[PDB]
Design brief:
This is part of a larger assembly, with 10 protein chains of 8 kinds. Chain A has about 200 residues and is α+β, with helices and mostly antiparallel strands. Chain A contains 5 helices and 12 strands. Chain F has about 200 residues and is α+β, with helices and mostly antiparallel strands. Chain F has a 5-stranded antiparallel sheet with strand order 10-1-2-11-12, covered by helices on one side. Classes of the chains: A alpha+beta (about 200), B alpha+beta (about 230), C alpha+beta (about 220), D alpha+beta (about 200), E alpha+beta (about 220), F alpha+beta (about 200), G alpha+beta (about 210), H alpha+beta (about 120). The complex binds magnesium ion (26 copies). One magnesium ion binds next to helix 1 of chain B.
Chain lengths: ~200, ~230, ~220, ~200, ~220, ~200, ~210, ~120, ~200, ~200
């Protein structure tokens, strides 16, 4: 898999490929690895599918309950909850998660919880097998407070490369855009992104 | 934790006439990927203690949280939290060494090596080490990881014994430590140019310095190294 | 796979004089080929005129010493501040050790003090708590280098009276604390020369009817 | 399983003033089982003495072999081999077997007949010259020998004092080794003569 | 073991500790680890000590012979090539790790060689268990265009790092200095900081102390 | 292992050697002779791994026979034993080692002494007044140490042996089906008619 | 290690060596391998030192409680069975012990039970245990008579250990001797095997091969 | 969960639930035992309030505990069965661990101790 | 393993059980009884791992004794054997399994028949005219298959057994130190006072 | 290590980092991994140092001899010879080599021989541990027929990133420029390239 989240001026965007493999067989070529845990808090999943689905399912539950009781939770709070599950169960999980969300006090925020359950807040984050191929490209091209249209491009290009090189990544590129405005899903197909 | 994932390298430290100094680079590595650059591994506790941590970062972050909460609990029903009954280094250390030995003894270690540096309310320097096995010791110098191998040798040239601690100023101690960081930068493949350094002085108190860089490096000579044996150009 | 043990050793030595006892150890603490400390003491006074050392894996040794002292303190509360006789301390320590028979304390333990007649006494334990009153015993890294020497110079083992051809065994004497201390320092300078884990410093605790007294000597630092 | 610890045994050699001494236990074992008390581990080729601890089949073989070579040497150089040279010989002969070696710990002692110097040396099982004026040790109680020796030895002992020292060093070490003992022999070597003594010791 | 090599402006110097160990036991307190390959090319070894002796003797010999054939002073790069090709052949089973330095007619040289047969060239080098202590010192003090007397001081300090801080090393410091003009200078025990104190006692025995069963005179003749 | 004993009295050497041969679960035979005569006054008994024991003995035998014919002379027992040791010592560093242990009892006509040699499969040789291979020593050495005198007659030797075999029958888990006993003396080699 | 015990007309003899070993290194030449459970009952130490010493001391505590409750000396049957039962509860955990439990009660007479960490418990008249075991058995098997004088029984026990100390590398140091009667056990001293060896050789003729 | 304290002290120092228990005994059929030079005999009465009694199957009043010890009782019959089962088990267990049958004293001491425990534990009468 | 045999003749059942107990290298004892009487007419012999065998037997014994006292009645041999089989069948899936094999010979007073039951450590039970545990069957079944008649007298049974023990002495590598033999008949259980 | 070679209009440039590690210890911080096998044929070494030095030493030998006899060899011929050593000895080599050279007929040529000894001719090539991080960046920034200064920058930036991210890469950046003009060595130090 290849996944990333990027903060920009108006909020934050998450993107991902859409391939799931069991060895070389592509089990699913249209996976949704962008997963909602609250209206405006989403995550990117990598690692085991069972593990990351089951975790995301639980976080969503916790935040539904948080909300019922204390109102809307901070992106940070959501990252705390993921981390607590991942840290406390490191011995039998294989999950690498990027959390991202938007509120008005803080605009976009991105937290990454790699294996082991450490948590790291960042301007952007990349992950999944495909990510190794684009550390160079991303460090070279990310700038803070990009526009939306710039940031969709930065993601589209980063992931087009991750895909090109990583056999465990491919398919369509999905994004989810998080701003004061609301929630926009995007999709880009092979004929667009291969050609870049 | 049964096997460390994101990791911090050497912490180094020494004590000088009036306090202690301690330092550590700002890197979290992921095997040989140098992944996270903005990582503070010096953790100040009150105004008389800095805890420096290496090894697994998820565990470090757990230990941070225990330290926050020790500070919070010591304040409870404690009119003298900011005075005679604040936390000493010696207390924070005993607590950590307890926890480590306990976690080891349940075969589920905190995969770290820690150095607690501070100045005791009675003026005394404190410098002790504990790690994932619960092993502890003190010395005028202390370092984890590579630092044990390269930094101690250099810092011991300054304080070879107890009797030298009074003689060692904070300018000398600090310059020694900075030089060590440069040496480790040269030779530890898991290290970073950027680091943090902290001083705990029984008169100036806690000075914490973020964002240092190794400077005054020598590489020029590298231009005359050609081949590996017999090549001349 | 996590290995919960290590080796910091460490050499310790305990000798029973006839109205006194000594217990000594280097002060150097190591890991692999590194020194961690050139002064990290490993012989402790635990009160009731009892000195203890637990050499081996330093964490397990520290835990054990802690626990024992706490045992002393609770003996007091529980038995009307009674003094803890060295033989009772030994039994008590067998119980602590054997308590961890299936995840042992990885240490060789020695204690020293006076039996109930004011005679010198030394007890030595294995890691799971078998134990023995003993007149002298070395422990840890360089024990194999020292016991033969003591067999010879304390017990006059293999020594005979010139001139009879080994028909009359050389007779034993009582050794002044000063004499015993020479043999201690000589054992340790020998060991330091020939064992890489021994050096730096020598600390000796001496137990007499009049209490506990400490004595320290530089050792070579390579 | 360890070939250097099946049969057991020790050898030690030290120097005095215008003399050298060399000594061994006498035990041939086979693990726990004592087998012989008349397994001398000290041989000589002219005025050069060789102690060999380790796997006994190899002790024997090496002796048979150095007897053979020092024989051929005498026949051609028309003179007995000296210790400095023998040492090199031992060393090169072991390193021929670098990747399949003899499981032994040799020790050389002798006095050079030209120069008059006391000389001693030892080696690992593949033949690195551990060269030392004071003393050398080898065997299953090499640790205990290092300890006795470092305490007992002082330089320039007269022959009759050196005897007393090396004897004590050997006996008290063998007594702390399960796999050595069962008797002991000591050679004292002076330039023109050599005396060999059997020691009284415990038998358990 | 700690061994180092430092170039200076007119040549090169190497140094070494003098301890050698079998496990945690010290078998020799004053072992000389500085080996000659030819008069102006010297060598220091770490690793298996039978392998470093064997392989310096062997190459020393092939060098001498090759020198006699060619009627030319032997070159370091020849020692280097011959060493490495042999180590490589044996796939690392010959446990020799060396710092070789010397002067030949092409100038002064400093190389290291690893057991598997890789080689490094440099201005300063260390190897052995004491390697990292020594390198910390070199990384701290080396400058370009050292005088000879600075290079010795530096190399000597580097080895001291190993002696004190490493348990694998050492006792004394040996040095060899190879200057372009001159005979190579070999300073056995250039430095001896580690003398045993007088013991508290003498352990000389009263004669007749030992029990005996037999005397024989032995036949040398 | 099987049972291999030997004892050197004053005028001869007595070899006692178990009769059983067992292959796993069955005892295949109860009357097997674990000796070969090497020359008229030299006897070798042996035990160890199947096939190897016999092949080795019969090879030693033929070599000594060859020597005798060639030189019209009988090698001393000492020489035979050195020859045998050297062969075993070659075996150990060979591609497939002979796993065989032997005792050599001989009467040395030139010195008019009996001699016993013990040699294990490594080539470890030693001259002894009494010996054994494998576990056989463990039961019997106590008794020999006690009772043995160098001036024993053959009859005394055979009594001392009877006692050793009784101790073995009592304390040893295996039924070795008795022993065959031979005597090597100045007049050669004969077999004791019955060890009842 | 070598340990033995046997029954005769005069009660029980118990005899043991005193050597402790860690690999080749001889840790001690002075280990008490007889545990004095109480003044009427003896145990021997083989296998684990701690395991024997700890549990046999504990056995002493249990036997005492039995006597306070029942107002009657505990039988050796019952004493042995308490220890085997405990030991069996730990089977598989890696206890290591092989011991003889020795006593002499009015109701049973002199009795010996062998107990080990396998669970095994066995009544018999002669046992030896340890790396020196096979050596000891030889001597005992060829001399033991039911009606040995006590003085000769003590000698036989001492000579059987000596046999083992001599051949077995893992046995030696000194011998310890005990005589167990209905009124309890009597210690019969500690004998250095160094001095004892030579004495026996000379006095008895034996150990011919050793040069003395 | 039910640990209500039922056998407790009243202010005169008595424990009514235990005294009330004796009342049950006083109502039970008479039993008697007498000892000889070397027999002991146990005799007990039957009720005659009902006489279509199957006498071969109906529980006897004397019970074997081991082959050498018997026990008889007065009072609640259902309650007697529980003491007897416990005693029979103790006897077999005693053989097992000490390799001897119980003394009579021991077995009595055991049963009494059970009875006593039930006067001092919550939830039981 | 040790030797555990049994045979059911016309009016009784005969159990033959080896006397040796050996611990590693030494034979510790040559007079051990590998039986327990479970009730006056029911006998159980046993073999398998050390400690386990006795502990198991003495536990079965005490249970049957408890039953007899409670009901003043002796369980039939069939019932005892079903009880024992069930206990072994629990052991097998337990944390540490009893490794014990048994034979149960009883005389059933109610039907006036002898009965023999063979049960291995897994709880595999079977009623047979003759049986054995471990390798013992391998040597002896040939002979029993041939000679056995259901109408044999006790004397005939003991002859047939004598022959079996001879075959075991001849062909079996281990010295099991003879057997103890017991007979279970209408009058109970007695031991044949000598056998070889 | 991180290494590359890049063809440009006037010829070809090779670059590399200068770090050699044994685990985490940096054995040598000023390594020369650019190695000459002929005047204008060079290579980049990655994998085992012993293996790549030893191979390079042999290739150089073969081409010295080629030259003596047939004149100057083609860059393709040099790649053939590396390949033949690497393919034929794949079972005991760990060597990943880029070969590059210049002649007038062909200007710059780059061949890469990864593990296994397959050979591949390319416009540019990257390799060593550090290469994984810059597949994206290089695919995105390389164009054919760059100028020398452009190409020195493309390399400098690609390797600055590989170094940044890979712990097994670092030190100075060396290059070697190959054109009609001759042979230029370049060096760039940390204070230059970290700052890009
Ligand atoms: Mg992952
Ligand atoms: Mg957080
Ligand atoms: Mg979960
Ligand atoms: Mg995992
Ligand atoms: Mg760590
Ligand atoms: Mg608190
Ligand atoms: Mg706690
Ligand atoms: Mg420079
Ligand atoms: Mg360990
Ligand atoms: Mg307790
Ligand atoms: Mg110093
Ligand atoms: Mg030859
Ligand atoms: Mg000639
Ligand atoms: Mg070879
Ligand atoms: Mg040397
Ligand atoms: Mg050979
Ligand atoms: Mg071999
Ligand atoms: Mg339990
Ligand atoms: Mg054995
Ligand atoms: Mg029961
Ligand atoms: Mg209740
Ligand atoms: Mg059936
Ligand atoms: Mg069998
Ligand atoms: Mg590679
Ligand atoms: Mg090749
Ligand atoms: Mg690489």
């Amino acid at each position: 898999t290849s996944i990333m989240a990027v903060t920009f001026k108006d909020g934050v965007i998450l993107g991902a490929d859409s391939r799931t493999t069991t060895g070389a067989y592509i089990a699913n070529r249209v996976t949704d690895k962008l997963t909602r845990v609250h209206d405006k808090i989403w995550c990117c999943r990598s690692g085991s599918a069972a593990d990351t689905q089951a975790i995301a399912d639980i976080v969503q539950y916790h935040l539904e309950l948080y909300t019922s009781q204390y109102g809307t939770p901070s992106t940070e709070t959501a990252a705390s909850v993921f981390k607590e599950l991942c840290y406390e169960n490191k011995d039998n999980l294989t999950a690498g998660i990027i959390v991202a969300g938007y509120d008005d006090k803080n605009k976009g925020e991105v937290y990454t919880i790699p294996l082991g359950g450490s948590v790291h807040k960042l301007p952007y984050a990349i992950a999944g097998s495909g990510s190794t191929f684009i550390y160079g490209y991303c460090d070279k091209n990310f700038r803070e407070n990009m526009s939306k249209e710039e940031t969709v491009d930065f993601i589209k290009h980063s992931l087009s490369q991750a895909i090109k090189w990583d056999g465990s990544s491919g398919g369509v590129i999905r994004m989810v855009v998080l701003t004061a405005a609301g929630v926009e899903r995007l999709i880009f197909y092979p004929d667009e992104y291969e050609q870049l | 934790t049964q096997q460390p994932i994101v990791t911090g390298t050497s912490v180094i430290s020494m004590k000088y006439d009036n306090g202690v100094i301690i330092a550590a680079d700002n890197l979290g590595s992921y095997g040989s990927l140098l992944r996270f650059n903005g990582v503070e591994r010096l953790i100040p506790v009150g105004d008389n203690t800095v805890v420096g941590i290496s090894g697994d970062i998820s565990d470090m972050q757990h230990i941070e949280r225990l330290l926050k909460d020790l500070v919070t609990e010591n304040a409870y029903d404690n009119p003298l939290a900011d005075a005679e009954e604040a936390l000493e280094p010696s207390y924070i250390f005993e607590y950590l060494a307890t926890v480590m030995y306990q976690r080891r003894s349940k075969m589920n270690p905190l995969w770290n090596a820690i150095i607690v540096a501070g100045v005791q309310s009675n003026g005394d320097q404190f410098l002790r080490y504990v790690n994932l096995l619960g092993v502890t010791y003190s010395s005028p110098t202390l370092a984890t990881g590579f630092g044990a191998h390269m930094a101690n040798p250099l810092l011991r040239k300054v304080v070879d014994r107890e009797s030298d601690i009074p003689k060692t100023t904070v300018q000398v101690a600090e310059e020694a430590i900075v030089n060590a960081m440069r040496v480790l930068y040269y030779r530890d493949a898991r290290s970073s140019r950027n680091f943090s350094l902290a001083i705990i002085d029984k008169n100036t108190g806690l000075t914490f310095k973020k964002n240092l860089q190794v400077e005054n490096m020598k590489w020029d000579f590298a231009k005359d190294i050609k081949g590996y044996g017999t090549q001349k150009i | 796979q996590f290995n919960p043990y290590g080796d910091n050793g460490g050499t310790i030595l305990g000798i029973a004089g006839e109205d006194f006892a000594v217990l000594a150890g280097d002060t150097r603490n190591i890991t692999d080929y590194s020194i961690n400390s050139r002064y990290e003491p490993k012989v402790f006074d635990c009160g009731d005129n009892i000195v203890m050392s637990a050499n081996g894996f330093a964490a397990d040794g520290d835990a054990l010493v802690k626990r024992f002292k706490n045992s002393v303190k609770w003996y007091h509360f529980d038995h009307n501040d009674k003094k803890l006789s060295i033989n009772s301390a030994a039994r008590n320590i067998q119980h602590l050790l054997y308590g961890k028979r299936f995840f042992p304390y990885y240490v060789h333990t020695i204690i020293a003090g006076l039996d109930e007649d004011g005679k010198g006494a030394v007890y030595s334990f294995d890691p799971v708590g078998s134990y023995e009153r003993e007149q002298c015993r070395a422990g840890g890294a360089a024990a194999s280098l020292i016991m033969p020497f003591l067999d010879n110079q304390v017990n006059f083992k293999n020594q005979y009276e010139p001139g009879t051809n080994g028909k009359v065994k050389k007779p034993l004497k009582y050794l002044s604390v000063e004499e015993v201390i020479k043999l201690v320092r000589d054992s340790f300078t020998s060991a330091t020369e020939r064992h890489i884990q021994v050096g730096d410093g020598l600390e000796i605790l001496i137990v007499t009817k009049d209490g506990v007294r400490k004595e320290f000597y530089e050792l070579k630092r390579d | 399983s360890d070939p250097s610890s099946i049969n057991g045994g020790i050898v030690v050699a030290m120097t005095g003033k215008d003399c050298v001494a060399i000594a061994c236990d006498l035990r041939l074992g086979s693990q726990s089982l004592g087998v012989s008390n008349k397994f001398e581990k000290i041989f000589h080729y002219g005025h050069v003495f060789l102690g060999i601890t380790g796997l006994a089949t190899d002790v024997t073989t090496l002796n048979e072999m150095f007897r053979y070579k020092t024989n051929l040497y005498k026949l051609k150089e028309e003179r007995a081999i000296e210790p400095e040279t023998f040492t090199q010989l031992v060393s090169s002969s072991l390193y021929e077997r670098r990747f399949g070696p003899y499981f032994v710990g040799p020790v050389v002692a002798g006095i050079n007949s030209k120069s008059g110097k006391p000389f001693i040396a030892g080696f690992d099982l593949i033949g690195c010259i551990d060269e030392a004026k004071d003393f050398i040790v080898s065997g299953t109680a090499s640790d205990q020998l290092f300890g006795m020796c470092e305490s007992l030895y002082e330089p320039n002992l007269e022959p009759e004092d050196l005897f007393e020292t090396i004897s004590q060093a050997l006996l008290n070490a063998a007594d702390r080794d399960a796999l050595s003992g069962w008797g002991a022999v000591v050679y004292i070597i002076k330039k023109d003569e050599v005396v060999k003594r059997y020691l009284k010791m415990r038998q358990d | 073991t700690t061994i180092v090599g430092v170039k200076f402006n007119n040549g090169v110097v190497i140094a070494a500790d003098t301890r050698s160990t079998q496990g945690p036991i010290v078998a020799d307190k004053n072992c000389a680890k500085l080996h000659r390959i030819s008069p102006k090319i010297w060598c220091a070894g770490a690793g298996t000590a039978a392998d470093t002796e064997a392989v310096t003797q062997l190459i020393g010999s092939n060098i001498e012979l090759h020198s006699l054939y060619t009627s030319r002073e032997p070159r370091v790069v020849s020692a280097l090539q011959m060493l490495k090709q042999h180590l490589f052949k044996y796939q690392g089973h010959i446990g020799a790790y060396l710092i070789v330095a010397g002067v030949d007619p092409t100038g002064s040289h400093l190389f290291s060689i690893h057991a598997h047969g890789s080689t490094d060239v440099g201005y300063y080098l260390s190897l052995g268990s004491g390697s990292l202590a020594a390198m910390a010192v070199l990384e701290s003090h080396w400058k370009q265009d050292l005088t000879k007397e600075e290079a010795i001081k530096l190399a000597s300090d580097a080895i001291q790092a190993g002696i004190w801080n490493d348990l694998g090393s050492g006792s004394n410091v040996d040095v060899c200095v190879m200057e372009i003009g001159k005979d190579a200078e070999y300073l056995r025990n250039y430095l001896t900081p580690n003398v045993r104190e007088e013991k508290q006692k003498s352990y000389k025995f009263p004669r007749g102390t030992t029990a005996v069963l037999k005397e024989s005179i032995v036949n040398i003749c | 292992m099987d049972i291999i004993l030997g004892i050197r009295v004053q005028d001869s050497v007595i070899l006692a050697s178990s009769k059983a041969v067992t292959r796993g679960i069955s005892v295949l035979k109860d009357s097997d002779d674990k000796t070969r005569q090497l020359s008229p006054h030299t006897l070798m008994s042996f035990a160890g791994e199947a096939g190897d024991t016999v092949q080795f003995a019969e090879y030693i035998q033929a070599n000594i026979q060859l020597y005798s014919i060639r030189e019209d002379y009988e090698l001393s027992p000492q020489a035979v034993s050195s020859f045998v040791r050297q062969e075993l010592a070659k075996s150990i560093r060979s591609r497939r080692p002979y796993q065989v242990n032997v005792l050599i009892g001989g009467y040395d006509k030139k010195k008019n002494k009996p001699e016993l040699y013990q040699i294990d499969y490594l080539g470890t040789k030693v001259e002894l007044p009494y010996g054994a291979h494998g576990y056989s020593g463990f039961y019997t050495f106590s008794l020999l140490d006690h009772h043995y005198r160098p001036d024993m007659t053959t009859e005394e030797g055979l009594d001392l042996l009877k006692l050793c075999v009784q101790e073995l029958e009592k304390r040893m888990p295996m039924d070795f089906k008795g022993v065959i006993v031979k005597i090597v003396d100045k007049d050669g080699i004969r077999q004791v008619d019955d060890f009842q | 290690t070598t340990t033995l015990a046997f029954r005769f007309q005069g009660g029980i003899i118990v005899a043991v060596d005193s050597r402790a070993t860690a690999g080749n290194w001889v840790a001690s030449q002075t280990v008490k391998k007889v545990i004095e459970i109480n003044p009427f009952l003896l145990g021997t130490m083989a296998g684990g030192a701690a395991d024997c010493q700890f549990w046999e001391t504990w056995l002493g505590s249990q036997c005492r409680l039995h006597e306070l409750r029942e107002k009657e000396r505990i039988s050796v049957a019952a004493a042995s069975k308490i220890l085997s039962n405990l030991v069996y509860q730990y089977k598989g955990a890696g206890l290591s012990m092989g011991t003889m439990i020795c006593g002499y009660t009015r109701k049973e007479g002199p009795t010996i039970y062998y107990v080990d960490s396998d669970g095994t418990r066995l009544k018999g008249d002669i046992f030896c245990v340890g790396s020196g075991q096979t050596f000891a058995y030889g001597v005992l098997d060829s001399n033991y008579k039911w009606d040995l004088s006590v003085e000769d029984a003590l000698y036989l026990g001492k000579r059987s250990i000596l046999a083992a100390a001599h051949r077995d590398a893992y046995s030696g140091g000194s011998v310890n001797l005990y005589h167990v009667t209905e009124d309890g056990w009597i210690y019969h001293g500690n004998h250095d095997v160094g001095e004892l060896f030579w004495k026996v050789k000379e006095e008895e003729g034996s150990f011919n091969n050793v040069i003395g | 969960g039910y640990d209500r304290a039922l056998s407790i002290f009243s202010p005169d120092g008595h424990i009514f639930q235990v005294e009330y228990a004796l009342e049950a005994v006083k109502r039970g059929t008479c039993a008697v035992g007498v000892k000889g030079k070397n027999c002991v005999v146990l005799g007990c009465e039957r009720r005659s309030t009902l006489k279509l009694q199957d006498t071969r199957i109906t529980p006897s009043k004397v019970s074997k505990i081991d082959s050498h010890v018997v026990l008889s009782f007065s009072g609640l019959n259902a309650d007697s069965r529980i003491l007897i089962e416990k005693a029979r088990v103790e006897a077999q267990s005693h053989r097992l661990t000490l390799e001897d049958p119980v003394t009579v004293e021991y077995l009595t001491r055991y049963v009494a101790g059970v009875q006593q425990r039930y006067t001092q534990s919550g939830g039981v009468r």
